[PDB]
Amino acid sequence: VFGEEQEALVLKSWAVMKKDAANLGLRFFLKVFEIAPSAKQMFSEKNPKLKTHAMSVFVMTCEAAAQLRKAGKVTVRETTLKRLGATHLRYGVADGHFEVTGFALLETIKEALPADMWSLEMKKAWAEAYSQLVAAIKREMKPDA
C-alpha cells in the first residue's frame, strides 16, 4: 500500500539531509540520549562508529521504503536481517529502544530539514518505513515461530 509519493517523500528529504550527515547523526544521537540516557551504556562525541550507525539507520530506512513500494514488504537480504537481529539482541536493544529511536528520528528530521519540506505526510512516511524495518529486525531477535 506504500505509495510512490511516500517513497518519494523519504528519498527527497534524504537527498537533502545526507549533505550534512555527520552532524545529522550527531543530532540523532544526542536526542536519543536526551530521552533515554541509559542507552549510552549500550555503546562504549565524534565517535565514528556512532556516525556509521546513524547513517546505517537512515540508509536502511530509505531502503525499506524502496522495498515497501516494490514488494509491499521489507525484503532485506535474509542474512543481513539475521545478523541485525543478533547484534541488537546481543547488545540488549528492546522494544523501548527501537521506539525512542524512532521518535528521535522524526524529531531529528524535523529539526534538520528545511521547514518548508516538513509536514504530516512526511512524518508518517519516515514513521512507516522505520517501523517496518524494526519489525523485520525484531523477527530475527526471537524464535522463528
Annotated binding site for heme b: 44, 49, 53, 83, 87-88
Query: Among candidates 112, 98, 110, 103, which has minimal Cα distance to 39?
Result: 98
Distances (CA, A) of 46 to 32, 34, 97: 16, 17, 22
Q: State the Cα–Cα distance between residues 125 and 41, nearest whole angstrom.
A: 30
Q: How far is the CB of 138 from ligand HEM (least distance, A)?
A: 9
CB 4 within 8 A of CB 72: no
| Binding-site member from 16, 22, 30, 42 for ligand HEM (CB under 6 A) | 42
| Binding-site member from 133, 138, 140, 141 for ligand HEM (CB under 6 A) | 133
Query: Among candidates 107, 114, 104, 108, which has minimal Cα distance to 16?
Result: 114
Q: How far is the CB of 42 from ligand HEM (least distance, A)?
A: 4
Q: Among residues 25 and 85, whose Cβ is nearest to a copy of itself?
A: 85
* Residues found near ligand HEM in the complex (CB under 6 A): 39, 42-43, 49, 53, 56-57, 60, 79, 83-84, 87-88, 91, 93, 97-98, 101, 133-134, 137
